[PDB]
Design a protein around this ligand. Structure first.
Ligand SMILES: [Ca+2]
Ligand SMILES: [Ca+2]
Ligand SMILES: [Ca+2]
Length: 183
């Protein structure tokens, strides 16, 4: 029905959403999902609005796994709203931290080529049908080639968090963003 005063204050501290926005999200989340529990099939349907269902399936599964921080197979409102807050309203530093953990498939603290390519392939499959791409990065192999060499500092075939944040900052989309710095 409505968020309790204790949960509302905990979510206030853990998100960048206002009290009005938090209450507005909770009713809509409960409307769109009566049980308060998002499974993979429902999550795939959300993503199916923006890109074709079959194409988006593999990447949608990987995102769902990162959303699910307690790894129990479902997403509650807290796990949804915190994950949505970081991705849409979080700082660039902490956005990349949330991203790093998604690429880290086994959960050791390192991104191998077997993991990095797998996520890149999943992005390319979803994107292919409506987005045209460049040319020197127009292959999942061409992409993972550019990434690892620009990031793997000590060349152990693995990517640490510190390598990830620094290496991603040279991305064209972030290059545009950094010119909008207030100071
Ligand atoms: Ca969960
Ligand atoms: Ca790993
Ligand atoms: Ca390394």
């Amino acid at each position: 029905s409505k968020l309790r005063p204790e949960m509302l204050q905990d979510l206030r501290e853990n998100t960048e959403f206002s009290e009005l926005e938090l209450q507005e999200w909770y009713k809509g989340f409960l409307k769109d999902c009566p049980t308060g529990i998002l499974n993979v099939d429902e999550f795939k349907k959300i993503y199916a609005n923006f890109f074709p269902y079959g194409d988006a399936s593999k990447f949608a599964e990987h995102v769902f796994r990162n959303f699910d921080t307690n790894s129990d197979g479902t997403i509650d409102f807290r796990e949804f709203i915190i994950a949505l807050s970081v991705t849409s309203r979080g700082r660039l530093e902490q956005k990349l931290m949330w991203a790093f953990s998604m690429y880290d498939l086994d959960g050791n603290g390192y991104i191998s080529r077997e993991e990095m390519l797998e996520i890149v392939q999943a992005i390319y499959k979803m994107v292919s049908s409506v987005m045209k791409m460049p040319e020197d990065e127009s292959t999942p192999e061409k992409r993972t080639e550019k990434i690892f060499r620009q990031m793997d500092t000590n060349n152990d075939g693995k990517l640490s968090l510190e390598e990830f944040i620094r290496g991603a900052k040279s991305d064209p989309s972030i290059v545009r963003l950094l010119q909008c710095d207030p100071s």
